[PDB]
From Swiss-Prot, chain B:
The gene is NIT2. The active site is at E41 (proton acceptor), K123 (proton donor), C158 (nucleophile). This is Deaminated glutathione amidase. GO terms for cellular component: mitochondrion. It catalyses: N-(4-oxoglutaryl)-L-cysteinylglycine + H2O = L-cysteinylglycine + 2-oxoglutarate; N-(4-carboxy-4-oxobutanoyl)-L-ethylglycylglycine + H2O = N-(2-aminobutanoyl)glycine + 2-oxoglutarate. Residues 2-274 form the CN hydrolase domain. GO terms for biological process: amide catabolic process. Substrate binds at R162, T188. Homodimer. Keywords: Cytoplasm, Hydrolase, Mitochondrion. It is found in: Cytoplasm; Mitochondrion. Its EC number is 3.5.1.128.
Length: 303, 296
């Protein structure tokens, strides 16, 4: 058995305050002897609008450097290793800017116990949706889409396939990750209330059953405090344009390859929390042996 | 709104008795003003073993021809059109035999109100799980979208539901409605039946139709057993199916579902809403957002 931790949190626009929460959750994860801890999409910050996002992304590299140090400090002080998967943002590159693309990168980082970044997965499918009885959201206004399929990570838990949030709606992506050798999929997310209530548990369980993988679902939760007086000052924003009522679904969970929820967030808390699960490689292998889906595909017709 | 009927039934090894049930369900569907009725996988028969199946499949062409006549009879008697989607078996062709492929075909027929077979979909993914491929030959083709009275229909069978790329392709081809006629086991039924149907609906933004076999089957066939000189120790005449036939909207809402308290053959009805489908697709334009550059 291999122990995983999945974090649920409520990001603000304040990267210093978010880092403190992140550090506490990683610290708890090590104390509970989790081999890897998974944190949600946008754990560095959430923003008020596309201009705010670009502003905050300029602060994310320092957040990441501080996180790398915090991880190594915690590993040193606990005499125990942990790896960290965490959603952040990164500013555009020089080449991006040269091409007229000043949008931020929505990135899932994998950081090992030595503070080394092993992967930066840039989100492929961006959240451009008219929410039913809700706001029109267009992630592509602030975020640039990725151009790479993420490599399978050989983590302490097993072979890991990485995805972010709306990526979960595109089954061919999860199928590809399994085809490449994934045993575990993660979907760190900031999921809406409306689509969360409808589809969050369904999609997680569906992906698990489709791919015969463990599925980890770290989610944002609660009403986000997006306030940034210093940026609001700089942007000349009126109090009228200042309020931001973004709310995330939470219900962070761990799902087995048969679609059984084996760990789930406590609904009684809307603050940060950690859930733990023990992953069973023998169960995963048994499930795949009994129903050998990857030996039964019609590649002659599909793809 | 267009009205669909989804049938739930329990096949024996007796094609004559199965035909009677199928005809009654089609009759009931016409009475309830359904424009198309969908029946499960293996509505002609279920078999004890591969040798039994090869024997029963020889009887399937007559079943189909009699069903074709019965559909035109029922349409004409009731003075109302209906189309029929129904899972049957077909024996290997003469050419199949000469090629060494002495296996039956698991086929989904689409039969229109004129009794004409518009599609013969041969199952692509065979149920080999802890072995269908012992008796059954896999299909060679993706089925065309059918322009049905309800809208654009994509067809599949049973285990096919477990391979999301198939359903995704049918949507890419223009499906508005997907069907998964099935004989689903109890163990995987309890675990996955509702999950898989809802997932395919949400994945593809299609109405999903789930006609299932239900209950305990008796596959006894004394005449075959005598001809085969079979010992009673070798009989394998019990099967159990999950039922829970349902209709699911493009948002994953179950809008019709089999009544658990009704034993044996039953129909469920739903009125399909093309405008609802269009609204869902407009608000979350998944097919304008796929990464074909990387995946397709």
């Amino acid at each position: 058995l291999k122990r995983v931790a999945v974090a649920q949190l409520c990001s603000s626009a304040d990267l210093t305050k978010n880092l403190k929460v992140v550090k506490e959750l990683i610290s708890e994860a090590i104390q509970k002897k989790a081999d890897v801890v998974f944190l949600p999409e946008a754990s560095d910050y959430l923003s008020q609008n596309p201009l705010h996002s670009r502003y905050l992304a300029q602060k994310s590299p320092k957040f990441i450097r501080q996180l790398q140090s915090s991880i190594t400090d915690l590993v040193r002080d606990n005499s125990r290793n942990i790896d960290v998967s965490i959603g952040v943002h990164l500013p555009p590159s020089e080449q991006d800017l040269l091409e007229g693309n000043d949008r931020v990168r929505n990135v899932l980082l994998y950081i090992d116990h030595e503070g080394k970044i092993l992967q930066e997965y840039q989100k492929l499918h961006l959240f451009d949706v008219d929410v039913p009885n809700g706001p029109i959201l267009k992630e592509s206004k602030s975020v640039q889409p990725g151009k790479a399929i993420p490599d399978i990570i050989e983590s302490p838990l097993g072979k890991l396939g990485s995805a972010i949030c709306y990526d979960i709606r595109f089954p061919e992506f999860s199928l590809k990750l399994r085809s490449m050798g994934a045993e575990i999929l993660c979907f760190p997310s900031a999921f809406t209330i409306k689509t969360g209530e409808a589809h969050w548990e369904l999609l997680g369980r569906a992906r698990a059953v489709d791919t015969q993988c463990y599925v980890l679902m770290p989610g944002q939760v609660g009403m986000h405090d997006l306030s940034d007086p210093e940026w609001e000052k700089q942007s000349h924003m009126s109090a009228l344009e200042k309020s931001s009522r973004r709310e995330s679904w939470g219900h962070s969970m761990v799902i087995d390859p048969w679609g059984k929820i084996i760990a789930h967030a406590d609904p009684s808390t809307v603050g940060p929390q950690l859930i733990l699960a023990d992953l069973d490689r023998e169960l995963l292998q048994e499930i795949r042996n009994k129903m050998p889906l990857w030996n039964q595909r019609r590649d002659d017709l599909f793809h």
